[PDB]
Amino acid sequence: DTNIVTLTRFVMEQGRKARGTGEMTQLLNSLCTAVKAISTAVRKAGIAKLDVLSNDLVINVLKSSFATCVLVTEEDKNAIIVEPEKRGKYVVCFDPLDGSSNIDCLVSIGTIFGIYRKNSTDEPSEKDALQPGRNLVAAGYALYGSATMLVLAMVNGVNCFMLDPAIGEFILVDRNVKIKKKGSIYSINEGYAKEFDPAITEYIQRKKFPPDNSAPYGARYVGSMVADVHRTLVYGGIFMYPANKKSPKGKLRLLYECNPMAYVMEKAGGLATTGKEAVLDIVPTDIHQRAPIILGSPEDVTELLEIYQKHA
Amino acid sequence: AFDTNIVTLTRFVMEQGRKARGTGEMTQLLNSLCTAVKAISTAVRKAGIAKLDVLSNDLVINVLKSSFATCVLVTEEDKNAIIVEPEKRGKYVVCFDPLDGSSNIDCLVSIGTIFGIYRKNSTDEPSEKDALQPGRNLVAAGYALYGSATMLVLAMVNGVNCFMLDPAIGEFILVDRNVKIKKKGSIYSINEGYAKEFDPAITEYIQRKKFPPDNSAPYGARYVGSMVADVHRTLVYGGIFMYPANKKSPKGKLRLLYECNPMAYVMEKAGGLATTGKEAVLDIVPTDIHQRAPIILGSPEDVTELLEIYQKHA
Amino acid sequence: AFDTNIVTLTRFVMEQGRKARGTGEMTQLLNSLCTAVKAISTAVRKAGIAKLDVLSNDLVINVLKSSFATCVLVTEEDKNAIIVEPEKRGKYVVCFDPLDGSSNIDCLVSIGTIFGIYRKNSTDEPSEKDALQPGRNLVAAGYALYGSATMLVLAMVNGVNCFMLDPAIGEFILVDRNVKIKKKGSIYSINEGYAKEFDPAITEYIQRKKFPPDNSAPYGARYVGSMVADVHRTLVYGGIFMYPANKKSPKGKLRLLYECNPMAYVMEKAGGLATTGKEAVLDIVPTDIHQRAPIILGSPEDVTELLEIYQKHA
């Protein structure tokens, strides 16, 4: 296409409006390079762990960005503090590559990231990453399925870019995404049926055997958080990974899995609650803490939230 | 890196269908399916930047004809099974669903091109009867999955071999020989939105997987909601996949001819059963090319743990 | 865009070598040359980010063997013509230069894989004698060029067809049917560094192109210095390409077997002459697989404007 709106033409053009320095653009342009390379690695990761190439790749692209200063990765015990020569104003938490076990079965997998601004004056530290999700300035994920997709939610909107492999560019395809109010799909690992709390297990029922002699909801669960969330965003519906007895605090880690999706979700007009509070309003105490997550089309998540304090 | 001895699926079917002296007709039919499968992957990868199943149907048909190895073709997307013109004829009957999941592209879920192949068992002029053979008479079946990679799985009489597209040289390269499914699994895949309409045999089974009586751990639910995807996760990780019938789709949803059957063949050559619930899917005599069938496939000790339950109900 | 009726060279040679009833053996040999040609293009494109001709030699040989359509193979890079093992034999003799220009990669000049093919004309056990046939007995010759595109040119008995690699679906797609060279040209291509050692026939000709006596405009000099490149610019734009002999390379530089001959065949099927200077390159009886020959190819009215001059000197 001639006037190809790249992700970069787009992030640089909205960045100009903050009367800024250019680091968001640098950040994202460098992140994009980790994403292409991981997409390429996964499109032939069967012709002859991966997590780590993907990981070392993302730290690398992001140090060199000259836009980072704290980096919180799924894979490292401690946060990574960017060397001074190369420090900048942003904080990025990220899961580099999600559902890596699911690549043997050819499950659509992805990289999820959340960017914060270091607002305080002292030496960069974990504390700076201990901000509530509400506070994020940018988030999204890159999906690796039939096509490689980058959904990017910033203050102005949630947008979708698809990588065009012919030119090695991410191109803008869906603009200012909004989720459907109510929709026909619930998504949850029904294998934990004996584990679930009553609120959920009533709701499941209400969708299979709908009291108003209606059409039941369909069941979906790819088992790769990014595929299910991206489905919930484009087609509407709900996704749940509620706490259960195998995992009372939730499974999906907060800083790099829940809070990005949550942000992307609310920015399109969905909700994401733990059933007891907004995901984005949680103040993290540990950079590796988990959360319950119910996200999706408002009326449904709501239908659930009422069932929560219809059972309170 | 850069490898002088690549196994393209052309070379590998040529070492099945040539030591067997069969003229390697098969090979040019399979080669041709690869050109089609490859173009559907490209188009899909750039999907959202450029119906797709009509055009993939037209594609598959055109390449198929030109293999000079077909006489009848059945599509999901076509009424009358296409009797190949004479000039280009050959002995095989190919059955196919060119773009399985056409809906699911929008949500970026893996989808695929399934295919079944027969050999015409008659001395005559082709007709869709030449196609109405059961699975036990399939010479080869397979499918190509458009996932985070484009993997072709091809099962002939020896067993199943996966092949994966190396997008750089554009050849399906061999990555797994003589595949055998896990014997028992830990995943049941089924659309529980239909909970209500399930026949009791199925329903007792879902509760036996969720709430094991013999105090093990509950099976993990999965369900991409794309047949290609759920079969393949079943083939490699084991697991049971069930699309039984309900009343809404009273004799099930999946067409026998080019869905339940090519899968069920791939399945059984890998040590996996495949049944309707009463009889095996590979022995039903097929009467309408678009005749539907229930199908339960996957690891033998689960298909069986469910057939007992089905037997225990009639 | 996205086209349901693609002409892959597999489909096109199958409509030359099948209406002719010849078993389409040829086709699996050509198919196999495409896997090799494709991997050499990828490796070359990423060249400077990862000998290449040894590995392309090993590649071509391996794919070749596995077509089950060869019995003798000659390489530029090998001494003894490779007599294919029995299990995998077939009737063709293939002659090749797997990576012509191995030197020139460094300077990013287009280079290519040339090939000549024969049919074994004997009732025996293969030997490099089965290879020592002249060009008039070539069943098909071609070359693939690794340029700004990867174009395969294939000339069989009907004429020449160019094919170009569509890197997305990874298939050589047909782009020019039954090619015919320009009759007269305006380009002479030759390494004038060798000015001094040129035989007088050649020298009078270079002055006739630079300084036309019959007051036209001077021919444009060209010369990539890669045989594949200069032949192809000659094939399409016309022009005369000359690597005559000098004393330094006293019976010329280009090996007959798999350089002068496959080119000269491609050339003549496109209405272009090809000679050593005395005799046509396609009728020399080949005695050593590495036997060299001068070659002048290109548009007929120029080859001729030079053969007159050669005749006028002896």
Place this chain on the structure above:
Amino acid sequence: DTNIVTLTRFVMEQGRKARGTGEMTQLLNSLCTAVKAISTAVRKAGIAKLDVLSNDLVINVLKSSFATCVLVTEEDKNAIIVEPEKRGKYVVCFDPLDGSSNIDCLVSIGTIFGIYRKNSTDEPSEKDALQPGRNLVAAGYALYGSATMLVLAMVNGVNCFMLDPAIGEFILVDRNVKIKKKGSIYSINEGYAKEFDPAITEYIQRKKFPPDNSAPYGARYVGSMVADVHRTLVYGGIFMYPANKKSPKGKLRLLYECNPMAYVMEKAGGLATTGKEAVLDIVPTDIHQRAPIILGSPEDVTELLEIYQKHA
């Protein structure tokens, strides 16, 4: 590769040292996108003028860069003045796609560009592009052959990046390039033999029939200025497109063909003269004016330059 040095990681990292604004990086990152897309267009421009897609593409990427303000293209009668909303400090002259007729014969073709800094205070104008080549701050070319190559010469050096099609990134492969002093190749269209001036036609002789009973030079002429120049830079030698009677002012246009190559050449230690003066020292009077060009390994160009005033 994990720590993949992209062209952008490289231009941003040396740009930081000018204590700058970030426009060189923006400029080049946007130019790179026109180059990938033209490379892709040419690698299948036979499966079914081009100049113009290539052209409109480059203007577009470069307006949107927010780094341009005057653009001088081979293809436009007048310079292009970047709209204010989008103007920046740089001036780019470029031939978008060179030797377009040569794509039918599969000749290695390319895009050549030269970047200037607008130093004056008034409305951007042609005059700003009327600077001597000496003055350039950045130049190079992108080659489209077996591989797509981007040679980029800035104040610190001439460097070579090759596009890795697997990731859509230009990666750095040759560092701080230097040409060989003397070498074995002359390159010139010998078809103009009756046209050439004595200086040249003596030199040609001296190389074919070398007076010191030496090895003669080899002849090369791909007929696509970028392939011949890139050969002359990597392997050493000389390239000439001298003035002749069909073209007394030279053929190769100055602002966008001669002066970039010339700059790249001198930065690697070669020379480029018109036989009567340095190419880079010419002060252009018209943005479309041509030059004689002799560039290459010093001793040879010199051997020629002496023959020039051995004949003066």
